[PDB]
């Protein structure tokens, strides 16, 4: 799960 | 292997059936994902895909794609899930073995991730893979609890 971007 | 023996079919992901891919993040992850995410997703082709299990779709991985200047790829993970009731089936590890297979093709390919730190079934997960926790970013979500991440990686 990455960051918002 | 798991992913070996379940009957999933894969699909890419491509601007008509994104919608699929937004409900999926919708009620997989708490972080919201914006249009960069989903155009770096579709970009990266054959690394992105849909899992459709008894004809429905309940999980996906999309991948980003960097090259470096020594010539070698880099895949980020940046999401990976499947749908509640149909965890613990195989079909995680379909996904993953999917996008390893890819990574093979290029060579000296490196993966990274992004995994919350209480997050101990996916770290579980990953290292059955040749996965290992390589860094920890403090503050790296901006309103979840715990803020940190692992940064969780696997080079060929
Ligand atoms: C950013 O997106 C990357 S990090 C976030 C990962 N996603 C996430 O945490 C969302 C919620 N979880 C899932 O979507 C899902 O559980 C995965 C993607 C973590 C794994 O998918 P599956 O559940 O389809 O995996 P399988 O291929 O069945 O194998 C599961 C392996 O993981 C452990 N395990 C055992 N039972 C489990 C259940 N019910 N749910 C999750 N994980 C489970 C075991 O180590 C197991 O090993 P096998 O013997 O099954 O291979």
Known sequence: MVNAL | GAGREVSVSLDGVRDKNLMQLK????????????????????????????AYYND??????????????????????????????????????????????????????????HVQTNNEDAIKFYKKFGFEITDTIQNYYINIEPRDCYVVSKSF
């Open chain 2, 23 to 50: 409900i999926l993040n919708t009620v997989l992850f708490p972080v919201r994902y914006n249009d960069k995410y989903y155009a770096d997703a579709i970009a990266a082709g054959e690394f992105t895909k849909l």
């Open chain 2, 56 to 113: 429905i779709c309940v999980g996906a991985i999309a991948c980003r794609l960097e090259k470096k200047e020594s010539g070698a790829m880099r895949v980020y993970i940046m999401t990976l899930g499947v749908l509640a009731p149909y965890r613990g089936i195989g079909i995680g590890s379909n996904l993953l073995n999917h996008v390893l297979d890819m990574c093979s093709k290029q060579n000296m390919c490196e993966i990274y991730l």
